[PDB]
């Protein structure tokens, strides 16, 4: 009866796989088979931005590589000085279940979001003294996994509704909705030029999104379990998936397929957060068994371990300058490394 | 020393913020956070209503504040979230005493399997479930005054032969007590199967009009605190 549609869909998939197969003329190990390894990476917590009560999910640097916002499950956005340990601001959140946080690239705003399905826009550099909300973005029907600022005007949220969204702050309403995924989306990453982005979901398949009209540009499908974190490679022509099946993987958009998987037998905990540094020769992967790992993204062998956290690592972000990595973690301690 | 006049005033501001944070910690440490799970068949709304009387359109999570003996409980009834739960459940690894609710008179194996999953989940270990078996009275009329038998959906209910009950409420006919204890025992077995010592599972036979549910959590709940203290005071 209706099975023609399902059969031809599965055939479109069976041809997509072979189209992808006909492209890998060499593996990313092979092109980096001849390259110099990175060595061993040792990093020490220069600062330790302690002061959060409960665990930490969210941590975004300000775009000055100095300011740091962190979201905690007691409901605090604490904006740190991160050269001193000074606490620039402390915002009392409403829904203490924040999962993400942001920092507008100007720096004038932070958006926290959370499990209340609402992306809140707190305003720092008001002509007045204290921080207070600018808008509240309520159109998602499921918790927010991530949120990123396009600018002072546009914010992109990833929700548990299998949907990513685009917002206009003053109009406080969606401009576009991205609706391809099948499991709930867990992490979002704007492109380096903010023209497009990629969303890693709980379908074991992240998808690139072109935020001008709202069409899923392409769809990579390689992970065994659901994907916990995404982060664009700084050139914009790749990105990193750290999934709950204890693997990191690197996809690149133009070759449209998996390139290299960062794996090792001992890891049975999944990923929670990934990030490249500045040059993309180093992929920091945050893990779940209480300590991060540092991955030579090209040659894929582990190179450098961070282990200073009692509890699991939940957020991890390099600076735009590349001279620090904060690692918030469920032990409620941020840690700046170098 | 090596820092300017503004750096001094800035460390002053940061210390002021530390002071506010420690006031908040004084507030936040002395409060108890309960995640309230359960299914749409469960009396999940009725437990919340009862303890609310004891004390926003697409909101992801609701919450009721309530206190029992000068102790502030903060119970989060998860709201308009999706059917899957394996990712937002991790946000309650630090709560005290997940309340779990099932419908005794019921399709119950789904609740059984879900609580079995809650028991074994990483980050959900070290959290001691509290069981509230609702529709206890509805189970009374479903067993003593009804047709459908628990023998199917549960073959090993004919060969059960109830253990020596301490003192069931005397209004209960023995068949009712036997089945009622059967349900509790199925839940407890999978509670004791994998969670060695640090989980506890606290069963309870709760109803729509059982006004002791607030206290029933205080007690149990107070006893979870005591287990945590025994361990983290090196006293255990």
């Amino acid at each position: 009866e209706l099975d023609q549609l399902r059969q031809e869909a599965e055939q479109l998939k069976n041809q997509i796989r072979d189209a992808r197969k006909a492209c890998a003329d060499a593996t990313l190990s092979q092109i980096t088979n001849n390259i110099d390894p990175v060595g061993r990476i040792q990093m020490r917590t220069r600062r330790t931005l302690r002061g959060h009560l409960a665990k930490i999910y969210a941590m975004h640097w300000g775009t000055d590589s100095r300011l740091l916002v962190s979201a905690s499950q007691d409901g605090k956005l604490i904006i740190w000085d991160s050269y001193t340990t000074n606490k620039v601001h402390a915002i009392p959140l409403r829904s203490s279940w924040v999962m993400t946080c942001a920092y507008a690239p100007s720096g004038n705003y932070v958006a926290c979001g959370g499990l209340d399905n609402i992306c809140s826009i707190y305003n720092l550099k008001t002509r007045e003294g204290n921080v207070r909300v600018s808008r509240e973005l309520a159109g998602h029907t499921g918790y927010l996994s991530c949120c990123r600022f396009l600018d002072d005007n546009q914010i992109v949220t990833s929700s548990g509704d299998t949907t990513c969204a685009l917002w206009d702050i003053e109009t406080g309403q969606q401009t576009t909705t991205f609706t391809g995924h099948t499991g709930d989306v867990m992490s979002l990453s704007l492109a380096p030029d903010t023209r497009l982005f990629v969303s890693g979901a709980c379908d074991a398949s992240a998808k690139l999104w072109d935020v001008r009209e709202g069409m899923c540009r392409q769809t990579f499908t390689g992970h065994e379990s659901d994907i916990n974190a995404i982060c664009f490679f700084p050139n914009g022509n790749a990105f990193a998936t750290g999934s709950d099946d204890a693997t990191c993987r690197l996809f690149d958009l133009r070759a449209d397929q998996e390139l290299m998987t960062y794996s090792h037998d001992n890891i049975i905990c999944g990923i929670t957060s990934v990030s490249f540094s500045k040059s993309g020769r180093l992929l920091l992967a945050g893990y779940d068994d209480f300590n991060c790992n540092v991955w030579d993204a090209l040659k894929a062998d582990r190179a450098g371990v961070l282990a200073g956290h009692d509890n699991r690592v939940s957020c991890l972000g390099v600076t735009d300058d590349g001279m620090a990595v904060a690692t918030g973690s469920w032990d409620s301690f941020l840690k700046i490394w170098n | 020393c090596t820092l300017s006049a503004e750096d001094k005033a800035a460390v002053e501001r940061s210390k002021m913020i530390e002071k506010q944070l420690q006031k908040d910690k004084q507030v936040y440490r002395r409060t108890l956070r309960l995640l309230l799970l359960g299914a749409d068949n469960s009396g999940k709304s009725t437990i919340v209503k009862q303890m609310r009387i004891y004390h926003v359109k697409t909101s992801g999570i609701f919450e009721t504040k309530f206190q029992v003996d000068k102790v502030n409980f903060h119970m989060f009834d998860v709201g308009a979230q999706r059917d899957e739960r394996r990712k937002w459940i991790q946000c309650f690894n630090d709560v005290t005493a997940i309340i779990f609710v099932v419908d005794s008179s019921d399709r119950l194996q789904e609740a059984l399997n879900d609580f079995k999953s809650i028991w074994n989940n990483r980050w959900l270990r070290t959290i001691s479930v509290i069981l509230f078996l609702n529709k206890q009275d509805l189970l009374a009329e479903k067993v003593l005054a009804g047709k459908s038998k628990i023998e199917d959906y549960f073959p090993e209910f004919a060969r059960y032969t109830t253990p020596e009950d301490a003192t069931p409420e005397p209004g209960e006919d023995p068949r009712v007590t036997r089945a009622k204890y059967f349900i509790r025992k199925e839940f407890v077995d999978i509670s004791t199967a994998s969670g060695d010592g640090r989980h506890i599972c606290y069963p309870h036979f709760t109803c729509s009009v059982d006004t002791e549910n607030a206290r029933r959590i205080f007690n149990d709940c107070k006893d979870i605190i005591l287990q945590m203290n025994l361990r983290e005071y090196n006293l255990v």
Partner: single-chain antibody
Amino acid sequence: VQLVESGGGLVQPGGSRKLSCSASGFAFSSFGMHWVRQAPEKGLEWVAYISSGSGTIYYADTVKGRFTISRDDPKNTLFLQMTSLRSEDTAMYYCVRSIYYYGSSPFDFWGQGTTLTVSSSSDIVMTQATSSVPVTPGESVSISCRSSKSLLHSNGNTYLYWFLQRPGQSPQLLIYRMSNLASGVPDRFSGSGSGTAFTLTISRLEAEDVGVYYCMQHLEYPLTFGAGTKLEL
């Protein structure tokens, strides 16, 4: 942000005066809070200070232990006393805030400060250039000022602020820490420095760009000022 004080008037050289403040427009219990005075036909002076949540209370070297800058957050006022005022500190007062976090801009907004009248030191000084420089619109003024001490701390930033004055309303910040513009200021004002000898570059001199370009440094606590170069139309 309206800063209105009280008191002020005829003051005897031995009469106790209560120069209270009042400020009901901003997050008062968050801000550092100085005081500044201008000798009538002269430059303007640093006076008592109080930080956010009073913990650091520096002072001048003419008031130091004299009349006690105080605070009352729930009423949002800077209470003051004073009694003697040796007939030469007589001037018109002001009320200034300054928030001190990383990236904050201090001295962003100043008040009016009633003008009580009398019935009769290894600090720094802001050395200035020729004070008149009368210029008509369209030219690039580069009025300057020099510091006794080298204003470049190990932080990496040069500590110099920059103000006007008008025939009338209060003074106002142009740039803070010598490079960065204020909030309600046109981009034509600018700042170029070296550490010890430095200036601001103006481009368009409109009818409201007329005034006196004072100066102040925030590296120690004399909180020094200059004589004030008075630009004419």
